[PDB]
Design a binder for this molecule. Sequence first.
Ligand SMILES: Nc1ncnc2c1ncn2[C@@H]1O[C@H](COP(=O)(O)OP(=O)(O)CP(=O)(O)O)[C@@H](O)[C@H]1O
Ligand SMILES: Nc1ncnc2c1ncn2[C@@H]1O[C@H](COP(=O)(O)OP(=O)(O)CP(=O)(O)O)[C@@H](O)[C@H]1O
Ligand SMILES: [K+]
Ligand SMILES: [Mg+2]
Ligand SMILES: [Mg+2]
Ligand SMILES: [Mg+2]
Lengths: 209, 207, 132
Amino acid sequence: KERERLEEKLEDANERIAELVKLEERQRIARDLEDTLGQKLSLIGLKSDLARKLIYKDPEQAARELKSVQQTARTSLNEVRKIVSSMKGIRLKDELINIKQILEAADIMFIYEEEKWPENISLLNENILSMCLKEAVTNVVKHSQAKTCRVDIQQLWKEVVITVSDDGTFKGEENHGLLGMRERLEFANGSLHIDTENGTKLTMAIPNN
Amino acid sequence: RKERERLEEKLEDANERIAELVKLEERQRIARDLEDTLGQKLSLIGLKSDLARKLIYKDPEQAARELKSVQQTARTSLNEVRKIVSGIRLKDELINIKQILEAADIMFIYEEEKWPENISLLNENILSMCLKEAVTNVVKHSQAKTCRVDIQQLWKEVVITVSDDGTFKGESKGHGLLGMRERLEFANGSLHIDTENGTKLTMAIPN
Amino acid sequence: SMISIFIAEDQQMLLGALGSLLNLEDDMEVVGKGTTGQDAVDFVKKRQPDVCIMDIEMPGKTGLEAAEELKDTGCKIIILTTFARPGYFQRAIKAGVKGYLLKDSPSEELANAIRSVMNGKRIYAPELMEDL
Ligand SMILES: Nc1ncnc2c1ncn2[C@@H]1O[C@H](COP(=O)(O)OP(=O)(O)CP(=O)(O)O)[C@@H](O)[C@H]1O
Ligand SMILES: Nc1ncnc2c1ncn2[C@@H]1O[C@H](COP(=O)(O)OP(=O)(O)CP(=O)(O)O)[C@@H](O)[C@H]1O
Ligand SMILES: [K+]
Ligand SMILES: [Mg+2]
Ligand SMILES: [Mg+2]
Ligand SMILES: [Mg+2]
């Protein structure tokens, strides 16, 4: 099929656009990481070179220098544990706690029971779902006039499926966050469906193993 | 009429929101590599420093050997971080001149997007040096309130223009203007100056 | 008298440095070294050392998986990690690890955790607690 070589061209085109955004990102990370760890790592080299070169001449000073290397490494590694944690984003377990707080503060009954919790999801897909879950619940709070909100989070077959249901009334037209969620799910080869009959129910799915 | 604009913004936001996901995916990938490389190395350093401190009197020769490994681990780890990319130095000069002009209360007019990415590393470095000097001159001599920097890819040259709204103070061997011209000309580039409405330098180099 | 230790760590440089650091103690002895979870299960079931220093992420079987297989052997397992990852802490407790420490904790604190664990105590790094 010619449709296969054209599918190739859209794949090759998308990747070219993608590599440029990744290149901007590598450039941002590389500059900031150096700005925060660069001198610390160079200080370990110098103080380690200096301590080696004093071992025989001034063992007392070599020891003083090694104490400094010891703590530079320790605190640089503590900064990395921070960097690395931040870079990974909003965990779904943490978002579920945020939505419980938000719904309680809004006097909306939150109904949730852990069933089929995803055993392993990519950090990316987990972060996408967190974003969508937050928005689904922001919409419930801002618009629905619901008294109850039902959240289901389950690994069904090769998907993680999230349903957010409320017993309020849908305020939109026949056809922002709703397109935002759909686009971000669809980017991940997921989906968003909505039912607005008896309140509002959002069914979001994203691939997973 | 302008529903055109309404729709165009609608599309750009869609592109920008997908862009955020592409970032966040790469951001994820780097965190995993730091946790694998950098994290494991900073632990090795800690442990080998600790040991080396304990062996100073007992076995000084081993303590010296551990400190070699520490220094190498440290050097490659700083090198593995610069290796996240592998390049542009004119972007680093951009940062320097923004700081210098802001510190001097001179409004800096530039556009980050228009900067040429493809130029030889040598010619990029020559342009960085000339950009630095053009701005040093603005700060030291012009008494300008505004400084503009343009960077344009025109046919087979990269052209940089540095303009200011101060007043030209000149009427020489070993100094900036001739220095920049000599270095640029050696690279088959050029330097032109206009001192009518303040001072404007046009510097070009092959690309 | 002398505490027998087995060390499981896939990164050879770190494995060697830990052995060196612990052999410096008067009341301790490294009786074996391994690079996988299986190396730990095999040595501990056969040679029965007092303590097993266990890295988590290793090829084949993780240190957490190895810890689960050794739950009812009389061996005291100390986990070492560089990073606090989610559910690592709860899986560590549920496997019955006696210690769960950072790899970069000063050697004086690791030797102290081995003695405390030998005295029937549970030594968990506050940093690794999945609450700050
Ligand atoms: N849970 C819900 N209950 C009732 N109406 C809802 C709803 N979620 C969405 N709507 C309706 O759909 C419209 C569009 O929703 P959407 O989430 O896309 O944007 P928005 O109005 O919340 C602005 P933003 O999400 O950017 O803060 C809302 O204006 C509202 O009328
Ligand atoms: N942007 C500018 N605005 C006003 N006057 C300027 C100017 N750039 C240059 N001039 C004038 O031209 C002279 C020559 O500049 P040039 O860069 O060659 O030497 P300099 O005075 O900056 C010493 P050096 O560059 O070695 O530090 C300056 O001393 C100044 O009087
Ligand atoms: K010993
Ligand atoms: Mg909304
Ligand atoms: Mg000058
Ligand atoms: Mg490991």
